[PDB]
Symmetry: C7
Subunit: 73 residues, 7 copies
């Protein structure tokens, strides 16, 4: 990560498990497969959670960047 | 399967098949994806609308504005 | 019927036809689509505002700002 | 009354005439439309605010920011 | 007030008392001193209101245009 | 014709920043840009007019600002 | 700091501990690694707090700027 490119953190995490925190306390965990500059992204083998609890399991999911709070490899 | 710099390709890969569209505020649609643009505006055919996870109605065609979408799953 | 990369063609296909509009905050309109732009600003004629299957207001013509739209169903 | 691709021309058609403006949070204003821009910022003269079919406030001239507007009608 | 320039209503109101209604129902009243195309504006001898009663007095205040619902001279 | 000059006039002097959701900051204005992103020093955060947090320096995003009062 | 460049406050804290406050009252503490003009930023050894106590450890997190209220560098 260059001191001027935060998104290089996403690049560094391609093909690896990440945690996505959305607004409203929704959370996703899965393998990062693709992303654009808007932080739209695709995860494979995804889990949607609540209270540290799986509420849905998704083989692949496209998440719109505008609803993201943070991404944590 | 999806180019690493094109997440919207996930939409293209699923054209004319059933998808799940989670919208803000616990609304969701399930129906056949017919079209989409780079804003994630999209058209479904033969879609059920759900609210709180209960079906409220079925719509023959529906255009969803992308700014309301949270995620999409095939 | 709709080009796969042009979802707004669903609106083009429905000029002079009845449509349903669902707004953020859940307000709903039914009326005849007369005009629209790429922002989804639109004009309806013979418009009805609904709330429980009940028409709460009729307007002969109305201009709806696209930014507040959830979806549009022709 | 409006080009099928120019919904905002509905505003031009209402210039110098009474209109009804519905805002977010259910506020309603009625007055004479004096000017407007592509953002739907607009000026009314002799404006009144309505709640439950009644004037809760007489505003005279008022400039309404477009971003808060739900719909406009004659 | 020219038909394609709503901002002229502000120009007409310079140095005159105005009422500014904000998102969230907060209201401000004061003398309009300055504004820009974004509707950022400066009032002098401002008062903040909650149900027609002054809740707060300010001598000078710059209000961000993005939070404004209406301005009424 | 330029309200942003009100900020210029107040550099290096105490200001009050009111944010959305009722949060409020007081501190010395050090820097700002056209977006109203701004830096304060000796910043105090207030609630009910009470000071609940002290920050030697804070960068506040403009999009959250309701008003600024010198 | 340049009176016309508030983000120079971020530059000044590259590789230093910072405090990030988000909308809806989330707060993070960590080492600032990079940031862009939108205030998207990356923290290392990040922690999530609540009422002054740590409630969550992350080893690297990318935070979207649109959700930031303030940063205390």
């Amino acid at each position: 990560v260059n001191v001027q490119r935060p998104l290089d953190a996403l690049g560094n995490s391609l093909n690896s498990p990440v945690i996505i925190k959305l607004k409203g306390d929704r959370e996703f965990r899965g393998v990062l497969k693709s992303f654009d500059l808007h932080m739209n992204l695709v995860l494979n083998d995804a889990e949607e959670l609540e209270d540290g609890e799986v509420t849905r399991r998704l083989g692949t999911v496209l998440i719109r960047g505008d609803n993201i709070v943070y991404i944590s490899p």
